[PDB]
Amino acid sequence: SWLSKLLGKKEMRILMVGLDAAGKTSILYKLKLGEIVTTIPTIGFNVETVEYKNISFTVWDVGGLWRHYYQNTQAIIFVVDSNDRDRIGEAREELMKMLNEDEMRNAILLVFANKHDLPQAMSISEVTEKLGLQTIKNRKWYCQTSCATNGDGLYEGLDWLADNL
Amino acid sequence: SWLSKLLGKKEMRILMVGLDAAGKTSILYKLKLGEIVTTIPTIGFNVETVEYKNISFTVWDVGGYYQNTQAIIFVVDSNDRDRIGEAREELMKMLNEDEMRNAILLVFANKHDLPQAMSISEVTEKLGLQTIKNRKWYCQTSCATNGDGLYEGLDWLADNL
Ligand SMILES: Nc1nc2c(ncn2[C@@H]2O[C@H](COP(=O)(O)OP(=O)(O)O)[C@@H](O)[C@H]2O)c(=O)[nH]1
Ligand SMILES: Nc1nc2c(ncn2[C@@H]2O[C@H](COP(=O)(O)OP(=O)(O)O)[C@@H](O)[C@H]2O)c(=O)[nH]1
Ligand SMILES: [Mg+2]
Ligand SMILES: [Mg+2]
């Protein structure tokens, strides 16, 4: 479904970021679009890439030069650990910094509220409020619950992304 | 060349482990042997792999694939005094595994560039390396940022297989 709408001749660049241990690597792997490749453009800055035909997913941790990899980004996936209540405030701050980058002003926002399987995970209502998504103007956004370990939620989120480019 | 020595017909499997943040991914990237590929064979277990001709490096974090292993590289953060005991415990666990009794051991005392780093004698001591019998081992200081020490360590590894 989403695969159909994303594939083509023109490069499709997706940025997936979030705090460490949000589940970003696990998501890449569960997509099955090919090998996860790690590069280190500078020491301490680990970048994971999955490239399949015209589609690129670029992943790194935030909250710890970036502007280079923002070129022609069409979507931001922001992954959050729904169970990490102590760092939701940090996640909000890193998301808002991303959303103030002019280079990516026309990128749509998909938020995965990940680790939905966990007994004290925040609800999608809670994650949406605490990330301040309602405050977003002139950008399409969606927040989608996910479990990156069984893959629940991932295709639903990507389907929305593909439909709204 | 440490590379030319490892090269040949016979498979050469190296296992590189250590605590998270020890410097293992950085070391792999510095080796320039090929793309680093991540797999997740089981939930929560991230494995990085570099394969070049007959040589494969397999990397994962311990703390917090043993068949035909010719060498173990253990990477320790020389500047992390609070966790070196944990590094010792995980190293000793691995060296007790039957499947790998025949593997030689290279220890990289990494992050040697940092001004407060433990000296090699102290790393050696706090890892209990001297207590290891019936295994060839070597401790080498390294800096993964600029490659200091890496070639020296790998050359010892290639020589002593
Ligand atoms: N329970 C649960 N654990 C998850 C989920 N997604 C990721 N994890 C675990 O959280 C840890 C961090 O995952 P990882 O993908 O490496 O996060 P990254 O640092 O953002 O790339 C790993 O142990 C994962 O197995 C999830 O949806 N549910
Ligand atoms: N100062 C210094 N920092 C290092 C060295 N090796 C790695 N690092 C840093 O330590 C952090 C963790 O290294 P990484 O390769 O990701 O460790 P891994 O978790 O064992 O794969 C990164 O911020 C690196 O920049 C080193 O030799 N010296
Ligand atoms: Mg990751
Ligand atoms: Mg690593």
From TrEMBL, chain B:
Pfam families, A to Z: Arf (PF00025)
UniProt-recorded Gene Ontology molecular function terms: GTP binding; GTPase activity; metal ion binding
Ion transport found in the keyword field: no
Cellular component GO terms, alphabetical: cytoplasm; Golgi apparatus; plasma membrane
Keyword vocabulary terms for this entry: ER-Golgi transport, Golgi apparatus, GTP-binding, Lipoprotein, Magnesium, Metal-binding, Myristate, Nucleotide-binding, Protein transport, Transport
Main location per the UniProt record: Golgi
CDD domains, per the entry: Arf1_5_like
InterPro entries the record matches: Arf1-5-like, P-loop_NTPase, Small_GTP-bd, Small_GTPase_ARF, Small_GTPase_ARF/SAR
Keyword Magnesium: yes
A biological process term (GO) from this entry: vesicle-mediated transport
Binding site for Mg(2+): 25, 42, 48
Subcellular location per the Swiss-Prot or TrEMBL entry: Golgi apparatus
Binding site for GTP: 18-25, 64, 110-113
Binding site for GDP: 21-26, 46, 110-111, 113, 144
Record-stated family: Belongs to the small GTPase superfamily. Arf family.
UniProt function note: GTP-binding protein involved in protein trafficking; modulates vesicle budding and uncoating within the Golgi apparatus.
Name used for this protein in its record: ADP-ribosylation factor
Species for this entry: Entamoeba histolytica (strain ATCC 30459 / HM-1:IMSS / ABRM)
